[PDB]
Amino acid sequence: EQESVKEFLAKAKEEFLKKWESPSQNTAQLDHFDRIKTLGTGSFGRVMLVKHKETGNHYAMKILDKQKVVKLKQIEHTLNEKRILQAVNFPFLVKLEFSFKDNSNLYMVMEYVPGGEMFSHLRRIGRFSEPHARFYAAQIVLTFEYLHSLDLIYRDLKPENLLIDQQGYIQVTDFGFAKRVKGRTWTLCGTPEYLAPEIILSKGYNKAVDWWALGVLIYEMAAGYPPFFADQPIQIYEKIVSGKVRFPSHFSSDLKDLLRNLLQVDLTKRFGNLKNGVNDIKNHKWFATTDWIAIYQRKVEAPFIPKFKGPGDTSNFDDYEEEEIRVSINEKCGKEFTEF
Numbered sequence: 001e002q003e004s005v006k007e008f009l010a011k012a013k014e015e016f017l018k019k020w021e022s023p024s025q026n027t028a029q030l031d032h033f034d035r036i037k038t039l040g041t042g043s044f045g046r047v048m049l050v051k052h053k054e055t056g057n058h059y060a061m062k063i064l065d066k067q068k069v070v071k072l073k074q075i076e077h078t079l080n081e082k083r084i085l086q087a088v089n090f091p092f093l094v095k096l097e098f099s100f101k102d103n104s105n106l107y108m109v110m111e112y113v114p115g116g117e118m119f120s121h122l123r124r125i126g127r128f129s130e131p132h133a134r135f136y137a138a139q140i141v142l143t144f145e146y147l148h149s150l151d152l153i154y155r156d157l158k159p160e161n162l163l164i165d166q167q168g169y170i171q172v173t174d175f176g177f178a179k180r181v182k183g184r185t186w187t188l189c190g191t192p193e194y195l196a197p198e199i200i201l202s203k204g205y206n207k208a209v210d211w212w213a214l215g216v217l218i219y220e221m222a223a224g225y226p227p228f229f230a231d232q233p234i235q236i237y238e239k240i241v242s243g244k245v246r247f248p249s250h251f252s253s254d255l256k257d258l259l260r261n262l263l264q265v266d267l268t269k270r271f272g273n274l275k276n277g278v279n280d281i282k283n284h285k286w287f288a289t290t291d292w293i294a295i296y297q298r299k300v301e302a303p304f305i306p307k308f309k310g311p312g313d314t315s316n317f318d319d320y321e322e323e324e325i326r327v328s329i330n331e332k333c334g335k336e337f338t339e340f
């Protein structure tokens with residue numbers, strides 16, 4: 001590739017490794033913030049809108065319950081998530097501003113992106129036009145080029161993890177399954193509709209699983225539904241491994257061709273995992289109109305800007321029962337989370 005790209009990625013890796021080897025720790029505390037609203041909830045954690053009491057800045061605070069993390073066998077994953085987030089720097093990755101822990105919980109305080117999740121916008125408008133899908137896809141391609149060059153696999157690409165910012169660009173969040181991997185890794189993780197065949201079949205897999213997931217995402221953005229859909233996970237998995245996908249007639253020929261090469265069941269033949277790497281994707285005819293540098297520099301006018309009233313507006317997120325952030329009088333799971 002152009003020496004310009006090589007030197008860019010070399011500097012990117014240098015800067016990542018310095019932070020990776022000496023991670024930041026304990027850079028704020030809970031009582032520096034006011035709680036505003038619950039933005040999302042899961043089996044071992046939540047994301048909250050908070051406001052810093054001295055600066056007035058809004059942030060999204062991800063709170064993980066240490067005991068539930070242990071019970072659900074997510075210790076290494078949560079340590080991965082924070083160590084990676086504090087070390088990365090790319091225009092389409094959410095920014096970690098602070099992290100800390102207390103007797104009960106782990107906390108990651110990130111920039112608040114008021115525009116909401118791509119999932120909501122996609123379901124609201126039905127499907128994205130190919131130019132609109134391509135604008136988002138280009139950002140993911142560049143983000144994976146960045147991550148993979150750092151030996152990072154992302155492992156959770158799906159519309160809910162892609163926030164739309166004030167300029168209409170993507171911010172990838174939720175690094176809960178991201179991992180630094182040289183070669184192969186083995187954990188069953190991800191979301192059913194987005195899993196590559198080699199994950200389903202319990203193989204040692206590599207960064208090619210992210211390129212498979214990009215194929216799923218592009219299909220879902222352009223069609224309005226994912227390519228492998230069913231009521232039970234096992235039925236989804238049967239479709240994924242089958243090597244068969246049906247395309248809507250409205251898809252362009254170029255889109256179908258790209259998707260056949262991303263949704264390639266044989267990982268040794270899948271775009272993004274060949275000798276030419278990401279350039280097989282970047283040079284594909286479906287991306288012929290994409291100015292890769294302009295996308296990186298955020299100089300392309302976005303397909304749409306989310307509607308929101310200001311940095312504290314929560315209208316693009318939905319409503320959840322507001323539960324306590326309780327902190328035990330006794331330290332829980334201290335040993336397991338020493339490095340956090």
Ligand SMILES: NC(=O)c1cccnc1
Pocket residue numbers: 039047060062094110111112113114163173174
């Ligand atoms: N960084 C995040 O996870 C996030 C989530 C929701 C809104 N803004 C930011």
